[PDB]
Design a protein around this ligand. Structure first.
Ligand SMILES: Nc1ncnc2c1ncn2[C@@H]1O[C@H](C(=O)N2CCN(CC(=O)Nc3cccc4c3CNC4=O)CC2)[C@@H](O)[C@H]1O
Length: 350
């Protein structure tokens, strides 16, 4: 029987929950009778993505109604959808392409999770949970509840939970010290480069199988740039509440997963308003979206030479900005080193 601790075993159960993969698809209005979990492949999802780029150029080239109608059919043939009595929305507007590209992004993540869970060498001797743990190529360890690094993490959660995000209440169940294979050796050329910060990253439970097995990825240059507030890069926050909104949780499923990563920011490009470009000026290594509220810099500590902005939310003094809270963006995967993984309970205030 399994040699992993119960929180780690329950974590594997979350990451590889077939019902949560199915639940996510039904939300995206995919017909499960026509498109089951087993029948979806990376070949057809990547083929549906190529059709979206054909839709993109058709709009730009002002193609006929027939060309637009063909592509909509081509797409809905590869990715069947259940709208019931409702007519399928035509792929013509830039927001339609944006919506379907965001759906295909999350659906490719579900495929990677299912391909891993089903695939691999079938051995009688080893435990299923122990085999699935191996597939992630990540070292997962339970952080002691009354340790100093646990208290730093709990203070970071308590202090950086904003007042505007008064919809829920965050509670830490377990803290996991994660170590992705080769991520450290890859991070090494940035490992001493100034302004390294411990930042938050919230995502859907379904994405976590791919995040641990591949690491936070930068969007394909094929995808539309419109949806990216600060271009195609890896986004983070210094406020837990901002990142926790990306966990995609409800009263039904109040358990979510969030990350803490060592982000080598370097010389940041401070921006007040959105720029969909992913190209930085000379000497700039990251982007700092200036928010109206920042954690008190006087309370900034240094856990293992990395800045932990665990201060209470105070006014930044930034005049005329679109952002309420700061967001940090890196345009190189090698600038990230995932250090922790948190299991949070959202206590939805009603
Ligand atoms: N290797 C990977 N396998 C599976 N999913 C992966 C992955 N790398 C990233 N993802 C996940 O895909 C998604 C993604 O890239 N996206 C969608 C979101 N979009 C904007 C964005 O990052 N916004 C944004 C802004 C501020 C904070 C935070 C976020 C997201 N999380 C936060 O804490 C950027 C492109 C995202 O939800 C991420 O968690």
């Amino acid at each position: 029987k399994s040699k992993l601790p119960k929180p780690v075993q329950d974590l594997i159960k979350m990451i590889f929950d077939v019902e949560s993969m199915k639940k996510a698809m039904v939300e995206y209005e995919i017909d499960l009778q026509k498109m089951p979990l087993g029948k979806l492949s990376k070949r057809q999802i990547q083929a549906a993505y190529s059709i979206l780029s054909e839709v993109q150029q058709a709009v730009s080239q002002g193609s006929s109604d027939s060309q637009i109608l063909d592509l909509s059919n081509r797409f809905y043939t590869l990715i069947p959808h259940d709208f019931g009595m409702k007519k399928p929305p035509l792929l013509n507007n830039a927001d339609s392409v944006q919506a379907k590209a965001e759906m295909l992004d999350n659906l490719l993540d579900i495929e990677v999770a299912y391909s891993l869970l089903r695939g691999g060498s079938d051995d009688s001797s080893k435990d299923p949970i122990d085999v699935n743990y191996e597939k992630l190529k990540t070292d997962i360890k339970v952080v002691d509840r009354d340790s100093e690094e646990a208290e730093i993490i709990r203070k970071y959660v308590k202090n950086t939970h904003a007042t505007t995000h008064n919809a829920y209440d965050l509670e830490v169940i377990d803290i996991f010290k994660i170590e992705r294979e080769g991520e450290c050796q890859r991070y090494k050329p940035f490992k001493q480069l100034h302004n390294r910060r411990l930042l938050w990253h919230g995502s859907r439970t379904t994405n976590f199988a791919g995040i641990l097995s591949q690491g936070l990825r930068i969007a394909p240059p094929e995808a539309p740039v419109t949806g990216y507030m600060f271009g195609k890069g890896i986004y983070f926050a210094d406020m837990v509440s901002k990142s926790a909104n990306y966990c995609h949780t409800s009263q039904g499923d109040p358990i979510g997963l969030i990350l803490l990563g060592e982000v080598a920011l370097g010389n940041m490009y401070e921006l007040k308003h959105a720029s969909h470009i992913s190209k930085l000026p000379k000497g700039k290594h990251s982007v700092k979206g200036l928010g109206k509220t920042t954690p008190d810099p006087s309370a900034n500590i240094s856990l293992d030479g990395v800045d932990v902005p665990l201060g209470t939310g105070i006014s930044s003094g930034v005049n005329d900005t679109s952002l309420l809270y700061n967001e940090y963006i890196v345009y190189d995967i090698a600038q990230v080193n995932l250090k922790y993984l948190l299991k949070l309970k959202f206590n939805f205030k009603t």
